Amino acid sequence: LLKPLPADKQIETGPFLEAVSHLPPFFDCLGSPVFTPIKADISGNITKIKAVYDTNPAKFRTLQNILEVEKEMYGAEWPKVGATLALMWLKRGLRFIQVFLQSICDGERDENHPNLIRVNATKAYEMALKKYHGWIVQKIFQAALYAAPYKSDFLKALSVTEEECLEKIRLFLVNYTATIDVIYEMYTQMNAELNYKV
Amino acid sequence: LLKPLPADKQIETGPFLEAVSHLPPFFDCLGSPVFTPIKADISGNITKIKAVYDTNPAKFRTLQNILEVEKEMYGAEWPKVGATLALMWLKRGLRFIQVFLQSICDGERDENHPNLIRVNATKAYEMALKKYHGWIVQKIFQAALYAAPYKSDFLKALSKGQNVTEEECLEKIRLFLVNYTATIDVIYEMYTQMNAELNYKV
Ligand SMILES: CCCCCC
């Protein structure tokens, strides 16, 4: 469990990194090597933010410290630089995981094919990543969906019943959603969000 | 350039690793983020072979030493393990680069769609990797060719900064290919002789 947001809504870097380093394996529960590059991309971001943090933990104590310090340090290159860029991408993946799991927990599905995960992953993708992907990467997303597991199999890998698995997940989603929201609002407030497409 | 093959055809782990270290950036010359995971995968292999070798340059002096030693270390798990597995996959990416450049150089081409490299990448894929990829990854490869550059850009990017003609670029590549092609053929031969090749698919 991620720690809850303090009153001031600031996120301490070290403990954020520690918690989110546990999430790349989420993609291993999908059950196919097709999803390895996704895990590697999210891990990459985390590694890079950690590297910046470790150069000076006091100065980069919060995620906000990271953005404001880097903004001065890189001037006209910022925000397409350093840990600011890595976190800009990381939050999108983290949002995918949030929308995806929330959707599953809320019982969104295709009534004709309730044990697929297509409508949920497609929803998450739409809300988290689609806007930042060119048409070629979107066609790759579509191919990758044919590697998706059965919902029941994914929930089994995420592990002690299935009805509770969903409840553990709902409990996880509280502070996770709240933290991700704060990070997005931070990017918006600092005009650190970019829109280029891969 | 890669060191030449000696008489004994034993490939020295340290130089080889140093030479192939220059190759992952090849994929950056393709000009799209779509090829990044391929860069990362080949780099991964190189790094893993280095981590095993660094533990004892002497015991792992040769590529053939890696296979011999690991065979003993890991028993029934081998060859699906360590640097042997890493190089099993590395060789396939290296052969992709071999076949693809070789093709380009030799011509080939389509010319109902004249200056797209779909045909050269495709030959290279078929001959090096397709057999080890299941239908989803192959479908992914198909979508990824849409991101492939035109020929000239590619060559432009390969020599980038040095100031060369297309013709000059090509012959530089041809020169490179001699100890590279020879070296990759020897690695493939070693895997066959040591019964270290696996055929599982991704
Ligand atoms: C480099 C991408 C810019 C997006 C902001 C409008």
PDB file of all heavy atoms in Angstrom, chain A residues 79-80 88 132 191-197, ligand 1:
ATOM      1  N   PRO A  79      10.243  21.009 -20.057  1.00  0.00           N
ATOM      2  CA  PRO A  79      10.181  19.779 -19.250  1.00  0.00           C
ATOM      3  C   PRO A  79      10.550  18.492 -19.971  1.00  0.00           C
ATOM      4  O   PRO A  79      10.355  17.441 -19.387  1.00  0.00           O
ATOM      5  CB  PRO A  79       8.706  19.719 -18.828  1.00  0.00           C
ATOM      6  CG  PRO A  79       7.957  20.243 -20.057  1.00  0.00           C
ATOM      7  CD  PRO A  79       8.920  21.273 -20.706  1.00  0.00           C
ATOM      8  N   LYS A  80      11.125  18.550 -21.188  1.00  0.00           N
ATOM      9  CA  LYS A  80      11.411  17.336 -21.985  1.00  0.00           C
ATOM     10  C   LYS A  80      12.800  16.861 -21.661  1.00  0.00           C
ATOM     11  O   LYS A  80      13.641  16.764 -22.545  1.00  0.00           O
ATOM     12  CB  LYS A  80      11.285  17.629 -23.481  1.00  0.00           C
ATOM     13  CG  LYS A  80      11.192  16.361 -24.354  1.00  0.00           C
ATOM     14  CD  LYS A  80      11.086  16.673 -25.856  1.00  0.00           C
ATOM     15  CE  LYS A  80      11.238  15.375 -26.683  1.00  0.00           C
ATOM     16  NZ  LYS A  80      11.036  15.586 -28.166  1.00  0.00           N
ATOM     17  N   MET A  88       6.756  12.154 -16.264  1.00  0.00           N
ATOM     18  CA  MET A  88       5.663  12.515 -17.169  1.00  0.00           C
ATOM     19  C   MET A  88       5.141  11.296 -17.854  1.00  0.00           C
ATOM     20  O   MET A  88       3.919  11.113 -17.978  1.00  0.00           O
ATOM     21  CB  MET A  88       6.123  13.544 -18.211  1.00  0.00           C
ATOM     22  CG  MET A  88       4.953  14.204 -19.000  1.00  0.00           C
ATOM     23  SD  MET A  88       5.574  15.045 -20.473  1.00  0.00           S
ATOM     24  CE  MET A  88       6.780  16.130 -19.680  1.00  0.00           C
ATOM     25  N   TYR A 132      -1.073  10.084 -26.712  1.00  0.00           N
ATOM     26  CA  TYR A 132       0.383  10.319 -26.844  1.00  0.00           C
ATOM     27  C   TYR A 132       1.022   9.287 -27.750  1.00  0.00           C
ATOM     28  O   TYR A 132       2.255   9.208 -27.850  1.00  0.00           O
ATOM     29  CB  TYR A 132       1.048  10.353 -25.437  1.00  0.00           C
ATOM     30  CG  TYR A 132       0.235  11.182 -24.500  1.00  0.00           C
ATOM     31  CD1 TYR A 132      -0.611  10.598 -23.585  1.00  0.00           C
ATOM     32  CD2 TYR A 132       0.229  12.579 -24.614  1.00  0.00           C
ATOM     33  CE1 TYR A 132      -1.418  11.353 -22.789  1.00  0.00           C
ATOM     34  CE2 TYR A 132      -0.550  13.346 -23.801  1.00  0.00           C
ATOM     35  CZ  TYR A 132      -1.393  12.738 -22.900  1.00  0.00           C
ATOM     36  OH  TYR A 132      -2.197  13.520 -22.096  1.00  0.00           O
ATOM     37  N   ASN A 191       2.826  23.595 -15.842  1.00  0.00           N
ATOM     38  CA  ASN A 191       2.883  23.600 -17.289  1.00  0.00           C
ATOM     39  C   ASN A 191       3.992  22.681 -17.810  1.00  0.00           C
ATOM     40  O   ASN A 191       4.648  22.988 -18.795  1.00  0.00           O
ATOM     41  CB  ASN A 191       3.060  25.034 -17.795  1.00  0.00           C
ATOM     42  CG  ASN A 191       2.879  25.169 -19.305  1.00  0.00           C
ATOM     43  OD1 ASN A 191       2.164  24.397 -19.978  1.00  0.00           O
ATOM     44  ND2 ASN A 191       3.521  26.193 -19.850  1.00  0.00           N
ATOM     45  N   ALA A 192       4.155  21.547 -17.124  1.00  0.00           N
ATOM     46  CA  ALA A 192       5.196  20.535 -17.368  1.00  0.00           C
ATOM     47  C   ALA A 192       4.687  19.383 -18.248  1.00  0.00           C
ATOM     48  O   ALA A 192       5.465  18.541 -18.655  1.00  0.00           O
ATOM     49  CB  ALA A 192       5.688  19.973 -16.041  1.00  0.00           C
ATOM     50  N   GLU A 193       3.394  19.347 -18.516  1.00  0.00           N
ATOM     51  CA  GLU A 193       2.796  18.401 -19.435  1.00  0.00           C
ATOM     52  C   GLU A 193       3.122  18.674 -20.900  1.00  0.00           C
ATOM     53  O   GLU A 193       3.017  19.798 -21.391  1.00  0.00           O
ATOM     54  CB  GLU A 193       1.262  18.389 -19.250  1.00  0.00           C
ATOM     55  CG  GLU A 193       0.488  17.314 -20.014  1.00  0.00           C
ATOM     56  CD  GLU A 193       0.832  15.864 -19.576  1.00  0.00           C
ATOM     57  OE1 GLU A 193       1.723  15.644 -18.746  1.00  0.00           O
ATOM     58  OE2 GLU A 193       0.222  14.927 -20.094  1.00  0.00           O
ATOM     59  N   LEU A 194       3.519  17.632 -21.602  1.00  0.00           N
ATOM     60  CA  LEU A 194       3.697  17.708 -23.035  1.00  0.00           C
ATOM     61  C   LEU A 194       2.730  16.780 -23.742  1.00  0.00           C
ATOM     62  O   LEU A 194       2.106  15.890 -23.145  1.00  0.00           O
ATOM     63  CB  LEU A 194       5.127  17.337 -23.406  1.00  0.00           C
ATOM     64  CG  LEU A 194       6.209  18.221 -22.827  1.00  0.00           C
ATOM     65  CD1 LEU A 194       7.584  17.553 -23.010  1.00  0.00           C
ATOM     66  CD2 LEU A 194       6.130  19.592 -23.494  1.00  0.00           C
ATOM     67  N   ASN A 195       2.638  16.948 -25.043  1.00  0.00           N
ATOM     68  CA  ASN A 195       1.608  16.293 -25.850  1.00  0.00           C
ATOM     69  C   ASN A 195       2.156  15.659 -27.090  1.00  0.00           C
ATOM     70  O   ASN A 195       1.401  15.232 -27.930  1.00  0.00           O
ATOM     71  CB  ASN A 195       0.563  17.334 -26.264  1.00  0.00           C
ATOM     72  CG  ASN A 195      -0.229  17.816 -25.103  1.00  0.00           C
ATOM     73  OD1 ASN A 195      -0.089  18.977 -24.693  1.00  0.00           O
ATOM     74  ND2 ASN A 195      -1.050  16.938 -24.527  1.00  0.00           N
ATOM     75  N   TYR A 196       3.466  15.599 -27.219  1.00  0.00           N
ATOM     76  CA  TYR A 196       4.021  15.019 -28.405  1.00  0.00           C
ATOM     77  C   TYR A 196       3.631  13.557 -28.420  1.00  0.00           C
ATOM     78  O   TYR A 196       3.267  12.992 -27.370  1.00  0.00           O
ATOM     79  CB  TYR A 196       5.525  15.198 -28.443  1.00  0.00           C
ATOM     80  CG  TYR A 196       6.341  14.411 -27.404  1.00  0.00           C
ATOM     81  CD1 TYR A 196       6.767  13.111 -27.676  1.00  0.00           C
ATOM     82  CD2 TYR A 196       6.743  14.999 -26.232  1.00  0.00           C
ATOM     83  CE1 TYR A 196       7.535  12.405 -26.789  1.00  0.00           C
ATOM     84  CE2 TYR A 196       7.530  14.345 -25.349  1.00  0.00           C
ATOM     85  CZ  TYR A 196       7.913  13.029 -25.617  1.00  0.00           C
ATOM     86  OH  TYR A 196       8.710  12.362 -24.707  1.00  0.00           O
ATOM     87  N   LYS A 197       3.637  12.976 -29.605  1.00  0.00           N
ATOM     88  CA  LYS A 197       3.190  11.624 -29.798  1.00  0.00           C
ATOM     89  C   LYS A 197       4.394  10.757 -30.153  1.00  0.00           C
ATOM     90  O   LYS A 197       5.306  11.223 -30.854  1.00  0.00           O
ATOM     91  CB  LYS A 197       2.184  11.538 -30.934  1.00  0.00           C
ATOM     92  CG  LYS A 197       0.862  12.288 -30.700  1.00  0.00           C
ATOM     93  CD  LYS A 197      -0.090  12.006 -31.856  1.00  0.00           C
ATOM     94  CE  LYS A 197      -1.497  11.656 -31.393  1.00  0.00           C
ATOM     95  NZ  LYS A 197      -2.275  12.861 -31.099  1.00  0.00           N
TER      96      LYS A 197
HETATM   97  C1  LIG C   1       6.899  18.726 -27.305  1.00  0.00           C
HETATM   98  C2  LIG C   1       5.385  18.567 -27.129  1.00  0.00           C
HETATM   99  C3  LIG C   1       4.654  19.882 -26.823  1.00  0.00           C
HETATM  100  C4  LIG C   1       3.221  19.750 -26.298  1.00  0.00           C
HETATM  101  C5  LIG C   1       2.656  21.020 -25.619  1.00  0.00           C
HETATM  102  C6  LIG C   1       1.548  21.682 -26.420  1.00  0.00           C
END
